Amino acid sequence: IIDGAPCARGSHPWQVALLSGNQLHCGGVLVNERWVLTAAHCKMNEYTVHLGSDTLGDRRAQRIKASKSFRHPGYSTQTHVNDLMLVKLNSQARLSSMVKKVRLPSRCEPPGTTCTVSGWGTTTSPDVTFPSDLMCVDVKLISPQDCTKVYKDLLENSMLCAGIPDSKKNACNGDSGGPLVCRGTLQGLVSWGTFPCGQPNDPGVYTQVCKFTKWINDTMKHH
Numbered sequence: 001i002i003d004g005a006p007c008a009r010g011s012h013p014w015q016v017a018l019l020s021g022n023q024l025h026c027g028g029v030l031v032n033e034r035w036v037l038t039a040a041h042c043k044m045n046e047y048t049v050h051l052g053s054d055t056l057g058d059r060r061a062q063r064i065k066a067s068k069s070f071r072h073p074g075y076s077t078q079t080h081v082n083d084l085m086l087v088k089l090n091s092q093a094r095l096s097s098m099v100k101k102v103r104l105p106s107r108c109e110p111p112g113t114t115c116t117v118s119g120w121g122t123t124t125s126p127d128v129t130f131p132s133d134l135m136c137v138d139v140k141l142i143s144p145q146d147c148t149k150v151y152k153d154l155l156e157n158s159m160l161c162a163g164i165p166d167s168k169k170n171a172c173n174g175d176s177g178g179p180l181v182c183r184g185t186l187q188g189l190v191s192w193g194t195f196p197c198g199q200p201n202d203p204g205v206y207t208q209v210c211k212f213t214k215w216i217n218d219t220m221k222h223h
Contacts, residue, residue: 002125002198003169004137007118009054012134013100014186015118015179017050017057018042018066018087024056024130027119027178029102029186033092035220037102038177039189039207040075040085047087052099054134056120062099065090070219072212081156083191084207085177086219102179102186108210111143115162115182117190117204119175125197130174139163139170141182142203150202158211160188163203170204172197180206 016036018026026042030051047066050057066087074082093099109115118136122128139162147161155161162180163170171178171190180188188206209216 001117001119001121001123001135001137001170001175002172003167004123004135007054007134007136010098012054012118012179013052013098014102015051015053015134017053017120018044018177019048019050020044024120024174026174026176027121027190028087029179029189030093030099031104031216032101033095034089036087036089037189038085038087039191040071040083041077041080042177043069043071043085049087049089051093052096055132062094064093070222072215079154079156080191080205082158082212084189084209084212086216088222103184104213104216105185105187105210108208109141109182109185109187111141111146113141113182115139115141115180115187117162117171117175117178117180119171119178119190121172121175121178122197123172125172126195128173137169139180139204141187147203151205155205158208159191160206160208161203162188162206163201165201167200168198170198
C-alpha cells in the first residue's frame with residue numbers, strides 16, 4: 001500500500017497472505033473455513049496461507065498449506081480479465097477473534113463510495129520496502145466512464161477502479177488479491193495498477209467481486 005497507514009489492530013480478520021518460500025507473494029480474503037479468494041495471476045502450484053495476522057509473522061499463528069486452486073475460466077494474462085482465483089485450504093481454518101469470513105456483496109457499490117484497501121505490499125515505489133504490519137489506505141470508487149479516460153481499451157465491465165483525485169494513494173506490488181471493502185462488504189480484489197505504483201490520477205483496478213458471486217459458490221464444490 002502506498003501513502004497509507006498501519007491498519008488498526010484486528011480490524012481485518014478476513015485478510016490473509018499467500019506465501020511462497022517464506023516470501024510474501026499475494027494477499028487474499030477468507031470466504032470460509034476452506035477457501036480464499038485472491039487474484040488469478042497469483043497462481044501457483046501451491047501456497048502457504050497466513051492468517052491472522054496483522055504481522056508477518058508470529059506465533060500463534062496460523063500457517064495452512066494449500067495444494068489445490070482454481071482460476072476463473074475466463075482469465076486472460078494479456079488482459080487481466082476475470083482476474084480472480086479460489087484456493088482450497090488443505091485443512092480447515094479455525095475461526096477466532098482474529099480470523100473471520102468476509103461478507104460477500106449483494107449489490108454493486110456505486111461510484112464515489114469511500115472504501116478501504118489493505119495489504120503487505122511495498123510502501124514505496126519504484127523503490128521496494130516491505131512492511132511487517134498490515135497496511136491500509138482509503139480510496140474512492142471511480143465511474144467506468146472516468147476510469148476509462150485513463151486506461152481506455154484495457155478495462156472490462158467486470159473491473160473496478162478506485163483512487164483519490166490527486167492521489168497518491170493505492171495498492172502496490174504484493175498487495176495483489178487483497179480486499180477492498182466498502183461499507184460492508186468486499187467490492188474488489190486488487191488486480192493491477194501503474195508502475196511505479198501510485199501517482200496521481202491513474203487508479204487501481206480491482207476485480208468487481210460483485211459480479212462473480214455466482215461462479216464463486218458454484219466453484220465450491222469441489223472438493
